Short mmCIF file of C-alpha atoms and ligand atoms in Angstrom, two decimals:
data_model
loop_
_atom_site.label_atom_id
_atom_site.label_comp_id
_atom_site.label_asym_id
_atom_site.label_seq_id
_atom_site.Cartn_x
_atom_site.Cartn_y
_atom_site.Cartn_z
CA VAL A 1 -121.89 40.70 43.05
CA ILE A 2 -118.50 41.61 41.05
CA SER A 3 -118.90 43.87 38.08
CA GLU A 4 -117.80 42.33 34.95
CA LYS A 5 -114.67 44.60 34.78
CA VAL A 6 -113.49 43.09 38.27
CA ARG A 7 -114.38 39.69 37.12
CA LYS A 8 -112.27 39.81 34.13
CA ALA A 9 -109.47 41.25 36.02
CA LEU A 10 -109.72 38.38 38.44
CA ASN A 11 -109.85 35.77 35.82
CA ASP A 12 -107.01 37.23 34.09
CA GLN A 13 -105.00 37.08 37.38
CA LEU A 14 -106.24 33.47 37.76
CA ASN A 15 -104.64 32.63 34.48
CA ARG A 16 -101.43 34.57 35.38
CA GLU A 17 -101.11 32.45 38.53
CA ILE A 18 -101.50 29.29 36.21
CA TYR A 19 -98.62 30.52 34.08
CA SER A 20 -96.66 31.29 37.14
CA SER A 21 -96.91 27.65 38.18
CA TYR A 22 -95.78 26.53 34.79
CA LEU A 23 -92.98 28.85 34.66
CA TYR A 24 -91.62 27.61 38.07
CA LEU A 25 -92.11 24.09 36.79
CA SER A 26 -89.91 24.80 33.79
CA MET A 27 -87.26 26.20 36.05
CA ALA A 28 -87.47 22.91 37.93
CA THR A 29 -86.89 21.13 34.50
CA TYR A 30 -83.72 23.29 34.09
CA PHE A 31 -82.46 22.61 37.59
CA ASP A 32 -83.02 18.87 37.49
CA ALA A 33 -81.31 18.76 34.09
CA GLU A 34 -78.14 20.14 35.86
CA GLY A 35 -78.43 17.92 38.92
CA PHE A 36 -79.54 20.85 41.27
CA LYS A 37 -81.96 18.64 43.19
CA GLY A 38 -82.36 21.14 45.90
CA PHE A 39 -83.12 24.09 43.53
CA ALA A 40 -85.50 21.91 41.68
CA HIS A 41 -87.29 20.89 44.86
CA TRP A 42 -87.67 24.71 45.68
CA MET A 43 -89.18 25.41 42.16
CA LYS A 44 -91.51 22.33 42.29
CA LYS A 45 -92.78 23.50 45.71
CA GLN A 46 -93.26 27.09 44.39
CA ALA A 47 -95.09 25.75 41.35
CA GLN A 48 -97.55 23.77 43.72
CA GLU A 49 -97.91 26.97 45.66
CA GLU A 50 -98.91 29.06 42.66
CA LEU A 51 -101.50 26.53 41.80
CA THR A 52 -103.06 27.10 45.19
CA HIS A 53 -103.10 30.81 44.50
CA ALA A 54 -105.10 30.06 41.12
CA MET A 55 -107.56 28.00 42.89
CA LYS A 56 -108.11 30.68 45.54
CA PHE A 57 -109.02 33.18 42.75
CA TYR A 58 -111.10 30.19 41.32
CA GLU A 59 -113.24 29.65 44.35
CA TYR A 60 -113.64 33.45 45.10
CA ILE A 61 -114.89 34.20 41.43
CA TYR A 62 -117.62 31.57 41.97
CA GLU A 63 -118.57 32.96 45.56
CA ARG A 64 -119.07 36.37 43.94
CA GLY A 65 -121.34 34.94 41.22
CA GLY A 66 -118.90 34.94 38.34
CA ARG A 67 -117.29 32.24 36.08
CA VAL A 68 -113.92 31.16 35.35
CA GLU A 69 -112.56 30.98 31.67
CA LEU A 70 -109.28 29.20 31.21
CA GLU A 71 -106.87 30.68 28.35
CA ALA A 72 -104.09 29.13 26.42
CA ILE A 73 -100.84 28.84 28.49
CA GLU A 74 -97.72 30.16 26.74
CA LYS A 75 -94.78 27.95 26.36
CA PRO A 76 -92.30 29.14 29.07
CA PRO A 77 -88.43 29.46 28.75
CA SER A 78 -86.68 26.26 29.44
CA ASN A 79 -83.11 27.52 29.88
CA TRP A 80 -81.26 30.03 32.04
CA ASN A 81 -77.70 31.12 32.35
CA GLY A 82 -77.09 29.67 35.72
CA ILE A 83 -78.67 29.64 39.21
CA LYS A 84 -78.44 33.31 39.85
CA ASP A 85 -79.96 34.04 36.31
CA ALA A 86 -83.00 31.79 36.96
CA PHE A 87 -83.69 33.41 40.23
CA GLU A 88 -83.45 36.85 38.93
CA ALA A 89 -85.93 35.84 36.19
CA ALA A 90 -88.24 34.58 39.07
CA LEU A 91 -87.94 37.84 40.89
CA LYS A 92 -88.70 39.79 37.80
CA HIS A 93 -91.83 37.67 37.23
CA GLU A 94 -93.03 38.02 40.64
CA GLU A 95 -92.59 41.91 40.40
CA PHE A 96 -94.92 41.59 37.36
CA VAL A 97 -97.25 39.61 39.44
CA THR A 98 -97.17 42.19 42.29
CA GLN A 99 -97.94 45.14 39.77
CA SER A 100 -100.89 43.04 38.26
CA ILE A 101 -102.47 42.50 41.66
CA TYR A 102 -101.99 46.10 42.60
CA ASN A 103 -103.97 47.11 39.33
CA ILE A 104 -106.84 44.85 40.51
CA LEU A 105 -106.59 46.55 43.91
CA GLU A 106 -107.00 50.07 42.26
CA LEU A 107 -109.97 48.90 40.12
CA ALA A 108 -111.69 47.35 43.11
CA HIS A 109 -111.17 50.62 45.17
CA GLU A 110 -112.62 52.48 42.23
CA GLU A 111 -115.79 50.37 42.14
CA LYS A 112 -115.91 50.41 45.89
CA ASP A 113 -115.86 46.68 45.87
CA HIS A 114 -114.71 46.19 49.60
CA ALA A 115 -114.99 42.40 49.27
CA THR A 116 -112.43 42.23 46.54
CA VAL A 117 -110.19 44.67 48.37
CA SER A 118 -110.26 42.37 51.38
CA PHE A 119 -109.72 39.33 49.24
CA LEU A 120 -106.69 40.89 47.71
CA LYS A 121 -104.95 41.88 51.00
CA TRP A 122 -103.71 38.19 51.44
CA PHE A 123 -102.05 38.26 48.11
CA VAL A 124 -100.36 41.62 48.56
CA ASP A 125 -98.66 40.27 51.78
CA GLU A 126 -97.88 36.89 50.11
CA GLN A 127 -96.11 38.62 47.08
CA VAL A 128 -94.02 40.51 49.82
CA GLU A 129 -93.00 37.22 51.33
CA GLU A 130 -92.18 35.48 47.96
CA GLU A 131 -90.14 38.54 46.63
CA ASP A 132 -88.23 38.65 49.96
CA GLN A 133 -87.46 34.74 49.80
CA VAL A 134 -86.14 34.99 46.26
CA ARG A 135 -83.98 38.14 47.10
CA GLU A 136 -82.83 36.24 50.26
CA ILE A 137 -81.68 33.16 48.01
CA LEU A 138 -79.98 35.73 45.63
CA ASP A 139 -78.04 37.38 48.50
CA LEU A 140 -77.00 34.21 49.78
CA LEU A 141 -75.50 33.19 46.38
CA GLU A 142 -73.97 36.53 45.65
CA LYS A 143 -70.52 36.72 43.91
CA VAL B 1 -80.56 5.25 29.08
CA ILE B 2 -83.69 6.00 26.91
CA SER B 3 -83.19 6.51 23.31
CA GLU B 4 -84.08 10.01 21.97
CA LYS B 5 -87.22 8.50 20.26
CA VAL B 6 -88.54 7.11 23.51
CA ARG B 7 -87.55 10.27 25.46
CA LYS B 8 -89.51 12.50 22.95
CA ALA B 9 -92.49 10.16 23.17
CA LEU B 10 -92.53 10.33 26.90
CA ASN B 11 -92.10 14.16 27.05
CA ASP B 12 -94.92 14.35 24.52
CA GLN B 13 -97.16 12.25 26.92
CA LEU B 14 -96.01 14.44 29.90
CA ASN B 15 -97.35 17.45 28.00
CA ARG B 16 -100.64 15.42 27.12
CA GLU B 17 -101.31 14.73 30.86
CA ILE B 18 -100.83 18.33 31.60
CA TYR B 19 -103.41 19.29 29.01
CA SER B 20 -105.83 16.42 30.44
CA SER B 21 -105.50 18.20 33.99
CA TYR B 22 -106.35 21.60 32.24
CA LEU B 23 -109.18 19.94 30.36
CA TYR B 24 -110.79 18.51 33.44
CA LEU B 25 -110.34 21.85 35.34
CA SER B 26 -112.14 23.52 32.43
CA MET B 27 -114.95 21.01 32.84
CA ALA B 28 -115.07 21.90 36.51
CA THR B 29 -115.42 25.65 35.52
CA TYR B 30 -118.59 24.56 33.47
CA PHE B 31 -120.12 22.43 36.11
CA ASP B 32 -119.43 25.09 38.82
CA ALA B 33 -121.22 27.69 36.68
CA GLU B 34 -124.20 25.45 36.59
CA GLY B 35 -124.13 24.83 40.39
CA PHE B 36 -123.19 21.25 39.90
CA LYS B 37 -120.84 21.15 42.99
CA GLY B 38 -120.61 17.35 43.04
CA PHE B 39 -119.61 16.91 39.41
CA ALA B 40 -117.26 19.91 39.78
CA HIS B 41 -115.52 18.31 42.66
CA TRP B 42 -115.25 15.05 40.60
CA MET B 43 -113.56 16.98 37.82
CA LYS B 44 -111.22 18.89 40.22
CA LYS B 45 -110.00 15.74 41.83
CA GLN B 46 -109.47 14.24 38.43
CA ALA B 47 -107.34 17.32 37.29
CA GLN B 48 -105.11 16.83 40.41
CA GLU B 49 -104.97 13.18 39.54
CA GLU B 50 -103.63 13.88 35.98
CA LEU B 51 -100.96 16.25 37.50
CA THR B 52 -99.62 13.37 39.44
CA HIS B 53 -99.56 11.40 36.30
CA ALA B 54 -97.49 14.24 34.69
CA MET B 55 -94.98 14.29 37.50
CA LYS B 56 -94.61 10.51 37.33
CA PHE B 57 -93.52 10.94 33.68
CA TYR B 58 -91.26 13.87 34.81
CA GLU B 59 -89.50 11.81 37.34
CA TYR B 60 -89.06 8.76 35.19
CA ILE B 61 -87.44 10.82 32.34
CA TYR B 62 -84.94 12.26 34.70
CA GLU B 63 -84.29 8.74 36.19
CA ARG B 64 -83.46 7.49 32.75
CA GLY B 65 -81.05 10.33 32.00
CA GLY B 66 -83.36 12.51 29.93
CA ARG B 67 -84.82 16.08 30.15
CA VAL B 68 -88.35 17.47 30.26
CA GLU B 69 -89.41 20.27 27.91
CA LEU B 70 -92.69 22.01 28.54
CA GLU B 71 -94.76 22.96 25.65
CA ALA B 72 -97.67 25.62 25.26
CA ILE B 73 -101.01 24.29 26.58
CA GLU B 74 -103.90 24.80 24.17
CA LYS B 75 -107.03 26.62 25.48
CA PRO B 76 -109.57 23.80 26.33
CA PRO B 77 -113.24 24.10 25.61
CA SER B 78 -115.32 25.76 28.50
CA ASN B 79 -118.76 24.70 27.42
CA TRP B 80 -120.68 21.47 26.97
CA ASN B 81 -124.26 20.64 26.40
CA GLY B 82 -125.13 19.15 29.81
CA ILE B 83 -123.68 16.58 32.16
CA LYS B 84 -123.77 13.65 29.80
CA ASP B 85 -122.02 15.77 26.92
CA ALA B 86 -119.18 16.55 29.24
CA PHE B 87 -118.56 13.15 30.51
CA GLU B 88 -118.80 11.59 26.85
CA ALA B 89 -115.99 14.27 26.04
CA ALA B 90 -114.12 13.06 29.08
CA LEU B 91 -114.40 9.35 27.88
CA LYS B 92 -113.48 10.19 24.18
CA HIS B 93 -110.44 12.12 25.59
CA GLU B 94 -109.40 9.18 27.84
CA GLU B 95 -109.58 6.92 24.85
CA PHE B 96 -107.12 9.14 22.94
CA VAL B 97 -104.84 9.13 26.09
CA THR B 98 -104.99 5.35 26.05
CA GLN B 99 -104.16 5.09 22.45
CA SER B 100 -101.13 7.48 23.03
CA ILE B 101 -99.76 5.36 25.81
CA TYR B 102 -100.18 2.10 23.74
CA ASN B 103 -98.02 3.73 20.94
CA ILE B 104 -95.24 4.41 23.48
CA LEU B 105 -95.47 0.80 24.62
CA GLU B 106 -95.16 -0.36 21.09
CA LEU B 107 -92.09 1.95 20.65
CA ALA B 108 -90.61 0.66 23.76
CA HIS B 109 -91.13 -2.89 22.69
CA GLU B 110 -89.25 -2.19 19.46
CA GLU B 111 -86.28 -0.69 21.12
CA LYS B 112 -86.33 -3.53 23.79
CA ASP B 113 -86.61 -0.78 26.36
CA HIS B 114 -87.86 -3.20 28.94
CA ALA B 115 -87.62 -0.45 31.78
CA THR B 116 -89.90 1.87 29.81
CA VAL B 117 -92.36 -1.12 29.27
CA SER B 118 -92.52 -1.92 32.90
CA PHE B 119 -92.89 1.91 33.88
CA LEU B 120 -95.94 2.10 31.39
CA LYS B 121 -97.90 -0.98 32.74
CA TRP B 122 -99.14 1.21 35.69
CA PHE B 123 -100.67 3.67 33.32
CA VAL B 124 -102.35 0.96 31.00
CA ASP B 125 -104.02 -0.32 34.13
CA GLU B 126 -105.00 3.22 35.22
CA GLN B 127 -106.49 4.05 31.93
CA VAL B 128 -108.77 1.05 32.28
CA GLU B 129 -109.93 2.25 35.67
CA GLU B 130 -110.50 5.81 34.64
CA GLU B 131 -112.43 4.60 31.39
CA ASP B 132 -114.48 2.41 33.61
CA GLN B 133 -115.26 5.10 36.06
CA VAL B 134 -116.55 7.40 33.38
CA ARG B 135 -118.52 4.73 31.74
CA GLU B 136 -120.05 3.77 35.09
CA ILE B 137 -121.21 7.58 35.66
CA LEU B 138 -122.67 7.82 32.11
CA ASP B 139 -124.51 4.47 32.68
CA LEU B 140 -125.83 5.85 36.04
CA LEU B 141 -127.17 9.09 34.42
CA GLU B 142 -128.66 7.14 31.40
CA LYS B 143 -131.90 8.32 29.73
ZN1 LIG C 1 -99.16 33.51 43.25
ZN1 LIG C 2 -96.03 33.93 43.00
ZN1 LIG C 3 -103.47 10.52 33.04
ZN1 LIG C 4 -106.56 10.30 32.57
#
């Protein structure tokens, strides 16, 4: 059974993944307003991906005997200064998500919760892949 | 091209469908905390359904030459007084959604926007079906 400290950290991260989904959807509203169909499609796909992350947290919290509490979702920005600016904001946000997950990992290690440590490995690896994808696009578009 | 009045009404409704999705997800967190797997599955399915409603508004707004702006999402309630209480709250919320859609229909009729009138017919019919499904469940569980 997860300690209340770890359950709160996971529930917090659940809410962060929801906001991530919303933020990527907002980036899609920007790209679509400009007619950048392909980049909008990229963002809508990532928004759906972030929802599956949230639900994986959701189901793990209930497997470990905890409960999920949904919080208010902040209004995301709706405008950026071009393609590169939007993707740089995406990368900055993913780096914040990576740091948040690592803080849960450290908490789980402290409490010797080796089930949460194992559950999080998938997300450490997926953040690497996501960060690399965004860097790959920024490098493609450079100068 | 949609007038700014109608675009704002549709964007408002887009945001209402997002909140509807969130509210049904919150009801799932309640049912799951109680071990009501089947009712939780019902709510998660409805939450996904409400997202597809939101995206149908999303794509229609861009077809008509408008843009979507995402707003803050309010924190939904997380607790109800039993199954019946949660479904009665669902029905009350769907009736509010039905009234909101009818107000867009009346606005569209006033501006003679027969494309928005036609777009909304699908949602008038779907609200009937959703309201009937929730009433059917409440009647099944009665007394
Ligand atoms: Zn994620
Ligand atoms: Zn992510
Ligand atoms: Zn709906
Ligand atoms: Zn509905």
